[PDB]
Amino acid sequence: SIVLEPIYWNSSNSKFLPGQGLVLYPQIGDKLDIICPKVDSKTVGQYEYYKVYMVDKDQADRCTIKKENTPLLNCARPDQDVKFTIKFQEFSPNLWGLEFQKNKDYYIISTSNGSLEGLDNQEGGVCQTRAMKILMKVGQD
Ligand SMILES: *[C@@H]1O[C@H](CO)[C@@H](O[C@@H]2O[C@H](CO)[C@@H](O[C@H]3O[C@H](CO)[C@@H](O)[C@H](O)[C@@H]3O)[C@H](O)[C@H]2NC(C)=O)[C@H](O)[C@H]1NC(C)=O
Helix, strand or coil: CCECCCEECCCCCCCCECCCEEEECCCCCCEEEEECCCCCCCCCCCCCEEEEEEECHHHHHHCECCCCCCCCEEECCCCCCCEEEEECCCCCCCCCCCCCCCCEEEEEECCCCECHHHCCCCECHHHHHCCCEEEEEECCC
């Protein structure tokens, strides 16, 4: 029904409010792209690395990820195009697809710290220091 504005997942994006992060209200059927940091020749900045995960409320609050969690976005090519389209669909086409329900809250965070060495860190990171997290209040407002 509508393509929401894309979310650029990087430390210079102001949509992430201090402390609170980003809060959205997507509706079933909408789509949203999460775009990995990309540096080329007209985009100034240092390589930024992140693993982005869908997690539960508790994990978001504590900025932690369990080793059973699998990234929905693995930003490991700071020099290329890497993005993930979240489709707020009720039914997934496969085992790895996402499914959403109306009037349900979903969270996305990264406990990576932006550096190559902290890509796999499972606690803190930008979730904790820069509020780089997203709350999606599906089917609401
Ligand atoms: C970090 O996130 C920034 C967004 O908060 C992002 O800025 C946005 O970058 C995109 C990609 O370059 C720009 O895209 C637009 O401009 C290009 C060039 O003309 C067009 O081809 C596209 O179609 C599109 O219109 C956005 O304009 C820009 N938005 C803002 C607010 O500046 C940074 O690029 C990200 N930085 C890194 C290092 O990934």
